[PDB]
Nucleic acid binder design. Structure first.
Ligand code: NEA
Length: 393
DNA sequence: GTTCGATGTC
DNA sequence: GACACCGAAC
């Protein structure tokens, strides 16, 4: 991976270190950040780079090169400035995940990192590691995916950062050519507290940061681009999640194992539905995208709630709210399934038209832009609903 | 019981 | 450039 020059130059403008200060680049390869910071701020620092691949490591002689897994690396002294672009990726089995390490190494990661949660990500580990290796008052400048702002895998990371110092987040979006990742820059300083959220505008040479909002009391809550529009909507309405039990569909292997599930259409078999069957305001009951068929009346053996018509909301159509009422009660292999809480009664058509409204599409795009290519549970449960828009107690 | 994607597909 | 994983992982 190459970090585009304008991205590097932006990060370097946010980078500060005392003269004589220790300046580290994790996962450095040839050390573009060390080169760039030296170019900009001068020669009077101790430059250090850590690189796991002896073939990749190629620092200039003025910098100390270290052959090490940065995540397991225990240097003698902490650092004044840490900058770079860590590896992004989930550590898992090669058939599904891009990061492949010997099980014992992954075990060491889980052991070393307090923020490690769920499948997690190499970049979350690099972020926590960077903070633990920082002197008080020390500065971190990383470019990472936006996903940590909102995702549950990084809930510990956000809490960690919020208690460890002060955090500035700069949204860049999709800045890496021929590479599908919405990026942010994090400038973290190991002192003080609070979050600052910034937008950016692209310049000829770098990025111009524009302050969006401040949260001096941030404790690790999800990070969103809130406006007066999004705030009014939320305070005026009820959150969807106070009205509904929200579940996800049974997964592919759960259908695979089921003794009445077939790979072929036939007598008394209904398609197992996917996200492609879910449409704004309706369901495609015909087309099969799963490769799986089963008897409709046996669906409830996977999930109880497949037995009754209920609200289905999309998960993988980007940051959007695509909802339908499944009136036929089919087996689903995908999507959110929302079942009314005790005492909650619904008007399915009003609720579906409200959730599919352009007003709603705007609301979620404002808040979550393109951090993730999903509508997540965290987003969905916070969708505001008024009783006129299809619920009563 | 459900999450996540330096991506894949078209 | 729109719209989707799907199953290993916990
Ligand atoms: N900084 C540019 C992208 S990150 C990719 C680089 O980081 C290196 N890398 C990946 N994992 C590493 C680790 N755990 N410790 C040090 N370097 C690592 C790779 O060898 C590669 O050179």
């Amino acid at each position: 991976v190459e970090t585009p020059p304008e991205v590097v130059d932006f990060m370097v403008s946010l980078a500060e270190a005392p003269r004589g200060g220790r300046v580290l680049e994790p996962a450095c390869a040839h050390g573009p950040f060390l080169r760039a910071f030296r170019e900009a701020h001068g020669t009077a620092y101790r430059f250090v780079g850590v690189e796991i691949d002896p073939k990749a490591l190629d620092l200039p002689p003025w910098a100390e090169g270290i052959l090490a897994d940065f995540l397991l690396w225990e240097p003698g002294e902490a650092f004044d400035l840490i900058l770079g672009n860590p590896p992004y990726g989930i550590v898992g089995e090669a058939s599904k995940y891009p990061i492949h390490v010997f099980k014992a190494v992954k075990d060491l990661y889980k052991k070393a990192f307090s923020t490690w949660k769920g499948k997690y990500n190499l970049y979350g580990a690099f972020l926590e590691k960077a903070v633990r290796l920082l002197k008080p008052g020390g500065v971190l400048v990383f470019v990472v995916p936006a996903t940590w702002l909102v995702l549950e895998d990084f809930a510990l990371l956000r809490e960690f950062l919020a208690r460890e110092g002060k955090t500035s987040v700069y949204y860049l979006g999709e800045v890496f050519p021929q590479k599908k990742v919405s990026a942010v820059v994090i400038r973290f300083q190991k002192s003080g507290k609070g979050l600052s959220l910034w937008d950016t505008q692209e310049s000829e040479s770098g990025f111009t940061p524009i302050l969006w909002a401040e949260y001096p009391h941030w404790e690790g809550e999800i990070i969103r681009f809130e406006t007066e529009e999004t705030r009014k909507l939320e305070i005026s309405g009820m959150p969807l999640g106070d009205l509904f039990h929200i579940r996800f569909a049974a997964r592919s292997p759960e259908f695979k194992k089921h003794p009445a599930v077939r790979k072929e259409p036939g007598p008394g078999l209904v398609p197992v539905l996917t996200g492609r069957n879910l449409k704004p305001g309706w369901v495609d009951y015909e087309k099969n995208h799963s490769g799986l068929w089963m008897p409709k009346e046996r669906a409830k053996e996977l999930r109880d709630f497949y037995a009754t018509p209920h609200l289905v909301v999309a998960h993988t159509k980007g940051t959007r709210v695509v909802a339908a009422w499944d009136e036929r009660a089919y087996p689903w292999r995908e999507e959110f399934h929302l079942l009314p809480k005790e005492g909650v009664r619904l008007d399915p058509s009003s609720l579906v038209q409200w959730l599919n409204s352009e007003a709603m599409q705007k609301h979620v795009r404002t808040l979550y832009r393109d951090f993730v290519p999903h509508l997540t549970l965290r987003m969905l449960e916070r969708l505001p609903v008024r009783r006129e828009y299809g619920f009563h107690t």
